[PDB]
């Protein structure tokens, strides 16, 4: 199965080599296309040529790539076209041990499989407190009735703590229960000029301390905090004090867009417009998956199938670009163009 | 023309293989260098060797790469050196169908061409409201004379709305006319403690609602908003209220640095110092383009030419690094070194 | 030495090709494995097969890759296993000019060497003022005794300046002495509604100006400032004024995670869990370096060795993934699983 994907990838990248009619192929390419096209035409009864010239030949080669991409991805598109009919036998073609795959394709699939099947630490994209319902004006005093220290969130990545003169307390629980961090990177600062409940300015005297797990931490320096050890603020000062604690970034085992090299650039390639046919085809193929059909996902995918499908579709887009096929898709209605940003934008519903 | 670029790229990457004198080449490399160097020396009358040993031979091979890079990029450098003279006939060398190009180079050019010639949605880099002339203190009440609800910008990615008791209104126009978003991702929060015009604190009672296109949206959860549907805030409460609405990120059809895999790393490679000669050469080549000559652009390039030139120049930098040529550039004056960060920094004007 | 790394890389990527038992290899792969395995078995006395089937054969091939990775990285792991013993003679294998390296591996090493040995401008990751001990409430007036203009930091990427009616002054020193910027990209805004020391709101009248090096700059537009030229604010207005100046991003010669294509994805791959053996092995290998052993570094590495080791280890992880070896590491105790996120997370101390 990983070999099946490695083969489809190998064949599609080889076809993207056919930029022109009379060019001379690197030997490696002809050896692969030869075997692949022969197995394919045999089990399918299509008549793909190794060096396409006419539009009909280009379409036919492109359809071979489409078949291979769908079979490796495990998708069955359904009747999307009067010109193309998916050949389920392609899976047999791709499982033939005689079709070789390249070192690049092999290594790329090993990556998809290796990272996708495990977990590892990664810098998450958004603010640690992005999913909060309430926020407090930054730098304005606020103490909850009966407490001497009150921590409150003032930004998507920030909290501020108000301390009564001489007060001390633990502040960690404000950070708990959200996300599932492995490490939280903090930097704390003295809020030098803040607003009192009444509206008048007040200063924070030097002398306030923040300690993590009992050890004293300087202000304005990154702190690696495990999220468990006690986060203790102490105002030894004889006046009210305010400190801000910023979560500069945190790491968890949720997958990000950096799980696979240049995943973002691949996703971008897949969701580009190109023209109405690609747009229609891409949409139709993605409808058979858990991926959005015309706009990049909000959260990065995290399973083998989604990642594979994106990689496979990105390569197919490149093949589309070099073969320039022309065929019909149900419900798609072409505009001669010559195609503009306005026209592209309108196609996204 | 895409083939021309694929060939230049193929040849340059092959030359970067010549790390040492006695190593044995992968066959594929010798087959390519053989043909390429032969066509080149023939139409040019230079005498490039396949396995350079002396400095003179290394310079000569490097000049062949420089010629190929300039011809594929469509640039004419002019008289930048007493040691090197660009050979315009190189275009004829690169258009020879007998020089093969690799699957990697072919696929890379297909990408540059495919993405560059169309449009597609992409997460933009900066705050949705980065280009605003005025900003309002966050969490401080502000109502425009005669209105019951007043929306105002309080950050590069943020707006806050002040609502009179019982008030309701549409807030979308504050977001309109800037950028050309396809989707805006929002999260709204109740500002739990804010400043009244006088300076005294006030609370926002639970009960405030935000609705998009008529449907009710919870606070602290990402909302996919098309930017057209009505953004309606309602304060059913008997006291003043404040809500913050954060644009966590938005997508448009403007090109970002993720349009091509690892574009940033390529750009970084091109603008690195290396030494005075590379610095001088790179600057001279970039002067013939719309790209800045010594500092990475502020906004990502978006046309085929710029992208190609960056990719081609990045590869040439790698060749420079392995061939270690030594030649003179007009106006450049070498410092033996051994080269430091201070010296590098000073070279950037 | 660069050739040594290019060879280890070439061999390891070839081994990741051995996905299954009966598949047919691309010729290029067999030519390389043949020579490499022969030199290796000869100088080492191990008996690696070219097409491993049993677990014992897979372990043996994996150990060959481990030896090659350690020798190219210059690491000596020590006695980490009763099943594996590092063979120092591997360096002799890798220095044999008859083992060929691929164009990909060669080009990848040229990059590591080229960028690592020089300096170049790069957009830094965090806020320009991330390392500040004190911060001032945003949008609240504050004037230092005896001055007419007072600049103060109000965010990790922001400063605000309070101007008395008719006042003018230079503001650049607030930006100096921190980081070592080559260029700072600014955008200034009028704070339209701010808090006076007493708590009452005040407006900033239009008419305030910001000029860089004597030239007038509009508000809400990015400004490329060298950090040296005078940053002059002028309030020609007859009332107090406040302006915010945002450092949207800056560039310096400190290395970022974009110094090498998809460095982040490689780092992610290396620090992924996989299973207890990989986790143990990776930790043991990283203990011999300046890199953290189980969590990605906070600051990007900047020397050849670290970068190389990461690249080499990432590839070895892929080999691990395809060969699926099974051996013992001192102090590591396997859990049959089938392995979950909870179990993975617990392994990170």
Short mmCIF file of C-alpha atoms in Angstrom, two decimals, chain B:
data_model
loop_
_atom_site.label_atom_id
_atom_site.label_comp_id
_atom_site.label_asym_id
_atom_site.label_seq_id
_atom_site.Cartn_x
_atom_site.Cartn_y
_atom_site.Cartn_z
CA UNK B 1 10.99 28.44 -22.39
CA UNK B 2 9.98 26.38 -19.35
CA UNK B 3 12.31 23.71 -20.81
CA UNK B 4 15.08 26.29 -21.05
CA UNK B 5 14.77 26.95 -17.32
CA UNK B 6 14.51 23.21 -16.52
CA UNK B 7 17.82 22.71 -18.43
CA UNK B 8 19.73 25.54 -16.74
CA UNK B 9 18.57 24.22 -13.37
CA UNK B 10 19.56 20.64 -14.27
CA UNK B 11 23.04 21.69 -15.36
CA UNK B 12 23.68 23.90 -12.34
CA UNK B 13 22.59 21.25 -9.85
CA UNK B 14 24.93 18.77 -11.64
CA UNK B 15 27.86 21.14 -11.32
CA UNK B 16 27.21 21.43 -7.55
CA UNK B 17 28.04 17.74 -7.49
CA UNK B 18 31.72 18.40 -8.34
CA UNK B 19 32.71 18.66 -4.68
CA UNK B 20 36.12 17.17 -5.18
CA UNK B 21 38.75 16.06 -7.70
CA UNK B 22 38.79 12.23 -7.59
CA UNK B 23 35.20 11.34 -6.59
CA UNK B 24 33.12 9.16 -8.90
CA UNK B 25 30.09 10.63 -10.54
CA UNK B 26 26.64 9.12 -10.65
CA UNK B 27 26.21 8.18 -14.40
CA UNK B 28 23.20 10.41 -14.84
CA UNK B 29 25.42 13.47 -14.04
CA UNK B 30 28.14 12.65 -16.55
CA UNK B 31 25.62 12.04 -19.31
CA UNK B 32 24.16 15.54 -18.76
CA UNK B 33 27.40 17.47 -18.19
CA UNK B 34 28.88 15.80 -21.22
CA UNK B 35 26.20 16.98 -23.61
CA UNK B 36 25.72 20.37 -22.00
CA UNK B 37 29.39 21.25 -21.79
CA UNK B 38 29.96 20.10 -25.33
CA UNK B 39 27.09 22.30 -26.75
CA UNK B 40 28.20 25.16 -24.57
CA UNK B 41 31.90 25.10 -25.52
CA UNK B 42 30.90 24.78 -29.17
CA UNK B 43 28.58 27.78 -29.48
CA UNK B 44 30.63 29.86 -27.04
CA UNK B 45 34.24 28.91 -27.70
CA UNK B 46 35.00 28.58 -24.05
CA UNK B 47 36.82 25.52 -22.75
CA UNK B 48 34.92 24.22 -19.79
CA UNK B 49 36.23 20.83 -18.49
CA UNK B 50 33.93 18.21 -16.96
CA UNK B 51 36.16 17.77 -13.93
CA UNK B 52 37.74 21.12 -12.92
CA UNK B 53 40.86 21.10 -10.72
CA UNK B 54 42.61 24.46 -11.07
CA UNK B 55 41.05 27.78 -10.10
CA UNK B 56 40.99 28.77 -13.74
CA UNK B 57 38.88 25.71 -14.56
CA UNK B 58 36.51 26.33 -11.68
CA UNK B 59 35.98 29.94 -12.74
CA UNK B 60 35.30 28.82 -16.27
CA UNK B 61 32.66 26.28 -15.14
CA UNK B 62 31.11 28.84 -12.81
CA UNK B 63 30.92 31.31 -15.70
CA UNK B 64 29.07 28.67 -17.69
CA UNK B 65 26.54 28.41 -14.89
CA UNK B 66 26.28 32.20 -14.61
CA UNK B 67 25.61 32.38 -18.37
CA UNK B 68 22.95 29.73 -18.11
CA UNK B 69 21.27 31.35 -15.11
CA UNK B 70 21.16 34.77 -16.84
CA UNK B 71 19.84 33.34 -20.10
CA UNK B 72 17.09 31.34 -18.42
CA UNK B 73 16.10 34.40 -16.33
CA UNK B 74 16.12 36.69 -19.36
CA UNK B 75 18.63 39.09 -17.83
CA UNK B 76 21.49 40.94 -19.45
CA UNK B 77 23.91 42.02 -16.64
CA UNK B 78 26.03 44.42 -18.61
CA UNK B 79 29.77 44.92 -18.09
CA UNK B 80 30.12 44.02 -14.45
CA UNK B 81 33.49 42.37 -14.73
CA UNK B 82 36.89 42.47 -16.41
CA UNK B 83 37.05 38.68 -15.93
CA UNK B 84 33.62 37.66 -17.12
CA UNK B 85 31.71 38.56 -20.22
CA UNK B 86 28.19 37.28 -20.68
CA UNK B 87 27.65 35.12 -23.78
CA UNK B 88 24.28 35.76 -25.28
CA UNK B 89 24.56 32.63 -27.46
CA UNK B 90 23.88 30.57 -24.29
CA UNK B 91 20.16 30.81 -25.05
CA UNK B 92 20.85 28.65 -28.12
CA UNK B 93 22.64 26.13 -25.97
CA UNK B 94 19.69 25.90 -23.57
CA UNK B 95 17.14 25.54 -26.40
CA UNK B 96 18.93 22.39 -27.76
CA UNK B 97 16.49 19.45 -27.35
CA UNK B 98 19.35 17.06 -26.86
CA UNK B 99 20.33 18.40 -23.43
CA UNK B 100 18.11 16.47 -21.02
CA UNK B 101 16.52 17.92 -17.86
CA UNK B 102 15.75 15.96 -14.70
CA UNK B 103 12.34 15.01 -13.26
CA UNK B 104 13.12 17.31 -10.24
CA UNK B 105 13.89 20.33 -12.37
CA UNK B 106 10.89 19.70 -14.62
CA UNK B 107 8.52 19.41 -11.70
CA UNK B 108 9.94 22.47 -10.02
CA UNK B 109 9.41 24.62 -13.14
CA UNK B 110 5.88 23.24 -13.58
CA UNK B 111 5.16 24.45 -10.10
CA UNK B 112 6.55 27.92 -10.69
CA UNK B 113 4.51 28.18 -13.83
CA UNK B 114 1.35 26.66 -12.49
CA UNK B 115 0.97 28.67 -9.30
CA UNK B 116 2.24 31.94 -10.72
CA UNK B 117 -0.22 32.02 -13.56
CA UNK B 118 -3.35 31.63 -11.44
CA UNK B 119 -4.78 32.66 -8.03
CA UNK B 120 -5.77 30.78 -4.93
CA UNK B 121 -6.75 31.44 -1.30
CA UNK B 122 -3.97 31.93 1.24
CA UNK B 123 -3.67 32.97 4.95
CA UNK B 124 -2.26 36.53 4.82
CA UNK B 125 0.70 37.44 7.15
CA UNK B 126 -0.26 40.63 8.93
CA UNK B 127 -3.09 41.99 11.04
CA UNK B 128 -6.33 42.63 9.22
CA UNK B 129 -6.17 46.28 10.36
CA UNK B 130 -2.48 46.89 9.97
CA UNK B 131 -3.09 49.82 7.66
CA UNK B 132 -5.16 52.08 9.88
CA UNK B 133 -4.24 55.68 10.73
CA UNK B 134 -6.02 55.82 14.08
CA UNK B 135 -6.46 53.42 16.95
CA UNK B 136 -8.55 53.56 20.20
CA UNK B 137 -7.38 52.58 23.70
CA UNK B 138 -8.39 48.98 24.25
CA UNK B 139 -11.19 48.42 26.72
CA UNK B 140 -12.21 52.05 27.15
CA UNK B 141 -15.75 53.05 26.33
CA UNK B 142 -16.41 55.26 23.34
CA UNK B 143 -19.68 56.13 21.74
CA UNK B 144 -20.02 58.38 18.71
CA UNK B 145 -22.53 61.21 19.26
CA UNK B 146 -26.09 60.09 18.43
CA UNK B 147 -25.40 56.36 18.06
CA UNK B 148 -26.30 53.52 20.46
CA UNK B 149 -23.56 51.14 19.28
CA UNK B 150 -20.08 52.26 18.22
CA UNK B 151 -17.43 49.92 16.74
CA UNK B 152 -13.88 51.10 16.72
CA UNK B 153 -10.41 49.58 15.97
CA UNK B 154 -8.17 48.90 18.95
CA UNK B 155 -5.33 46.85 17.53
CA UNK B 156 -3.83 45.65 14.21
CA UNK B 157 -6.16 42.64 14.45
CA UNK B 158 -8.88 43.90 16.72
CA UNK B 159 -12.05 45.93 17.11
CA UNK B 160 -14.25 46.64 20.17
CA UNK B 161 -17.88 47.65 20.18
CA UNK B 162 -19.55 49.77 22.92
CA UNK B 163 -23.27 49.04 23.35
CA UNK B 164 -25.81 51.20 25.29
CA UNK B 165 -28.25 49.24 27.50
CA UNK B 166 -30.74 47.43 25.26
CA UNK B 167 -28.94 48.50 22.02
CA UNK B 168 -28.50 46.50 18.78
CA UNK B 169 -26.76 47.20 15.49
CA UNK B 170 -24.78 45.94 12.51
CA UNK B 171 -21.02 46.14 12.72
CA UNK B 172 -19.72 44.81 9.36
CA UNK B 173 -18.82 48.09 7.65
CA UNK B 174 -15.81 48.59 9.95
CA UNK B 175 -14.32 45.53 8.19
CA UNK B 176 -15.21 46.54 4.62
CA UNK B 177 -13.13 48.28 1.95
CA UNK B 178 -9.78 47.03 3.28
CA UNK B 179 -7.93 44.06 1.76
CA UNK B 180 -9.99 41.82 -0.47
CA UNK B 181 -10.78 38.91 1.81
CA UNK B 182 -12.46 35.70 0.81
CA UNK B 183 -12.96 34.65 4.39
CA UNK B 184 -12.35 36.33 7.77
CA UNK B 185 -11.90 34.23 10.87
CA UNK B 186 -13.30 35.85 13.95
CA UNK B 187 -13.60 35.21 17.65
CA UNK B 188 -15.64 37.55 19.89
CA UNK B 189 -15.35 38.08 23.60
CA UNK B 190 -17.22 40.01 26.30
CA UNK B 191 -14.89 42.69 27.74
CA UNK B 192 -15.60 41.80 31.39
CA UNK B 193 -14.02 44.94 32.92
CA UNK B 194 -13.75 48.19 30.97
CA UNK B 195 -13.19 51.90 31.54
CA UNK B 196 -16.07 54.36 31.31
CA UNK B 197 -15.35 57.76 29.70
CA UNK B 198 -14.80 59.14 33.18
CA UNK B 199 -12.31 56.49 34.17
CA UNK B 200 -14.30 54.23 36.42
CA UNK B 201 -14.62 50.49 35.84
CA UNK B 202 -17.79 48.90 34.51
CA UNK B 203 -18.73 45.23 33.88
CA UNK B 204 -20.35 43.58 30.89
CA UNK B 205 -23.28 41.41 32.03
CA UNK B 206 -23.73 38.00 30.40
CA UNK B 207 -26.49 38.07 27.81
CA UNK B 208 -24.86 40.00 24.98
CA UNK B 209 -25.08 38.27 21.62
CA UNK B 210 -23.25 38.34 18.29
CA UNK B 211 -24.91 36.81 15.25
CA UNK B 212 -23.61 36.26 11.73
CA UNK B 213 -26.12 36.28 8.89
CA UNK B 214 -28.93 35.84 11.41
CA UNK B 215 -27.45 32.83 13.19
CA UNK B 216 -26.19 33.06 16.76
CA UNK B 217 -22.49 32.61 17.42
CA UNK B 218 -20.90 31.64 20.76
CA UNK B 219 -18.06 33.67 22.18
CA UNK B 220 -14.56 32.23 22.22
CA UNK B 221 -14.94 29.98 19.18
CA UNK B 222 -13.61 30.65 15.68
CA UNK B 223 -16.15 31.89 13.21
CA UNK B 224 -15.76 31.63 9.46
CA UNK B 225 -17.27 34.84 8.14
CA UNK B 226 -17.51 35.75 4.46
CA UNK B 227 -17.27 39.44 5.16
CA UNK B 228 -20.67 40.14 3.54
CA UNK B 229 -23.27 38.60 5.88
CA UNK B 230 -24.48 40.95 8.62
CA UNK B 231 -22.46 41.02 11.82
CA UNK B 232 -25.09 41.87 14.39
CA UNK B 233 -24.39 42.75 18.02
CA UNK B 234 -27.22 42.88 20.58
CA UNK B 235 -27.08 44.03 24.24
CA UNK B 236 -30.36 42.83 25.84
CA UNK B 237 -28.81 43.83 29.14
CA UNK B 238 -29.85 46.82 31.27
CA UNK B 239 -26.29 48.19 31.52
CA UNK B 240 -23.58 49.31 29.10
CA UNK B 241 -21.64 46.51 27.42
CA UNK B 242 -18.40 46.09 25.47
CA UNK B 243 -17.39 43.24 23.16
CA UNK B 244 -14.06 42.63 21.43
CA UNK B 245 -13.97 41.03 18.02
CA UNK B 246 -10.64 39.59 16.96
CA UNK B 247 -9.65 38.78 13.37
CA UNK B 248 -7.52 35.72 14.13
CA UNK B 249 -6.51 35.42 10.43
CA UNK B 250 -8.02 35.99 7.02
CA UNK B 251 -7.52 34.57 3.50
CA UNK B 252 -7.24 36.39 0.20
CA UNK B 253 -5.81 35.85 -3.30
CA UNK B 254 -2.68 37.88 -2.67
CA UNK B 255 0.44 35.75 -2.93
CA UNK B 256 2.28 34.89 0.23
CA UNK B 257 5.71 33.36 0.87
CA UNK B 258 4.08 29.91 0.91
CA UNK B 259 3.18 29.99 -2.81
CA UNK B 260 6.18 27.83 -3.62
CA UNK B 261 7.76 25.21 -1.29
CA UNK B 262 10.32 26.80 1.01
CA UNK B 263 10.37 30.07 -0.95
CA UNK B 264 11.60 31.80 2.22
CA UNK B 265 14.63 29.52 2.55
CA UNK B 266 15.50 30.23 -1.12
CA UNK B 267 15.15 33.97 -0.65
CA UNK B 268 17.36 33.69 2.45
CA UNK B 269 20.00 31.80 0.50
CA UNK B 270 20.06 34.45 -2.29
CA UNK B 271 20.43 37.39 0.11
CA UNK B 272 23.13 35.84 2.25
CA UNK B 273 26.46 37.55 2.12
CA UNK B 274 28.95 34.69 1.45
CA UNK B 275 31.70 37.17 0.56
CA UNK B 276 32.18 40.41 -1.31
CA UNK B 277 32.14 38.86 -4.73
CA UNK B 278 28.88 37.01 -4.25
CA UNK B 279 27.43 40.05 -2.59
CA UNK B 280 28.54 42.23 -5.52
CA UNK B 281 27.41 39.73 -8.18
CA UNK B 282 24.02 39.11 -6.57
CA UNK B 283 23.44 42.85 -6.24
CA UNK B 284 24.41 43.41 -9.91
CA UNK B 285 22.10 40.66 -11.15
CA UNK B 286 19.15 41.84 -9.01
CA UNK B 287 19.58 45.46 -10.30
CA UNK B 288 18.21 44.23 -13.59
CA UNK B 289 14.98 43.08 -11.93
CA UNK B 290 12.07 44.45 -9.89
CA UNK B 291 13.42 42.71 -6.82
CA UNK B 292 15.37 44.58 -4.14
CA UNK B 293 19.10 44.12 -4.67
CA UNK B 294 20.27 43.43 -1.11
CA UNK B 295 17.41 43.01 1.33
CA UNK B 296 14.51 40.55 0.98
CA UNK B 297 11.32 42.19 -0.33
CA UNK B 298 8.68 43.38 2.16
CA UNK B 299 5.84 41.91 0.16
CA UNK B 300 6.13 38.54 -1.54
CA UNK B 301 6.73 38.66 -5.32
CA UNK B 302 3.86 37.37 -7.42
CA UNK B 303 4.99 36.93 -11.02
CA UNK B 304 6.76 34.09 -12.78
CA UNK B 305 9.91 36.10 -13.51
CA UNK B 306 10.67 37.12 -9.94
CA UNK B 307 10.03 33.67 -8.55
CA UNK B 308 12.14 32.03 -11.27
CA UNK B 309 14.99 34.46 -10.82
CA UNK B 310 15.02 33.78 -7.07
CA UNK B 311 15.06 30.00 -7.58
CA UNK B 312 17.69 30.20 -10.29
CA UNK B 313 19.86 32.58 -8.21
CA UNK B 314 19.56 30.37 -5.11
CA UNK B 315 20.87 27.40 -7.07
CA UNK B 316 23.67 29.55 -8.54
CA UNK B 317 24.60 30.45 -4.94
CA UNK B 318 24.98 26.78 -4.15
CA UNK B 319 27.16 26.30 -7.23
CA UNK B 320 29.22 29.30 -6.10
CA UNK B 321 29.63 27.67 -2.77
CA UNK B 322 30.97 24.37 -4.19
CA UNK B 323 33.10 25.78 -7.08
CA UNK B 324 34.61 28.60 -4.93
CA UNK B 325 35.41 30.84 -7.93
CA UNK B 326 37.60 33.96 -7.67
CA UNK B 327 37.18 36.83 -10.03
CA UNK B 328 36.81 40.60 -10.04
CA UNK B 329 33.67 42.74 -10.09
CA UNK B 330 33.77 46.49 -10.85
CA UNK B 331 33.58 48.53 -7.71
CA UNK B 332 34.03 45.60 -5.35
CA UNK B 333 37.04 45.59 -3.04
CA UNK B 334 37.85 42.29 -1.16
CA UNK B 335 38.80 41.99 2.47
CA UNK B 336 40.91 38.85 3.21
CA UNK B 337 39.00 38.40 6.49
CA UNK B 338 38.76 35.70 7.57
CA UNK B 339 35.23 37.36 7.38
CA UNK B 340 32.97 38.08 10.30
CA UNK B 341 29.41 39.04 11.03
CA UNK B 342 30.55 42.66 11.50
CA UNK B 343 32.15 42.74 8.07
CA UNK B 344 29.12 41.05 6.46
CA UNK B 345 26.71 43.52 8.09
CA UNK B 346 28.74 46.51 6.89
CA UNK B 347 28.43 45.39 3.28
CA UNK B 348 24.69 45.99 3.24
CA UNK B 349 25.23 49.71 2.73
#
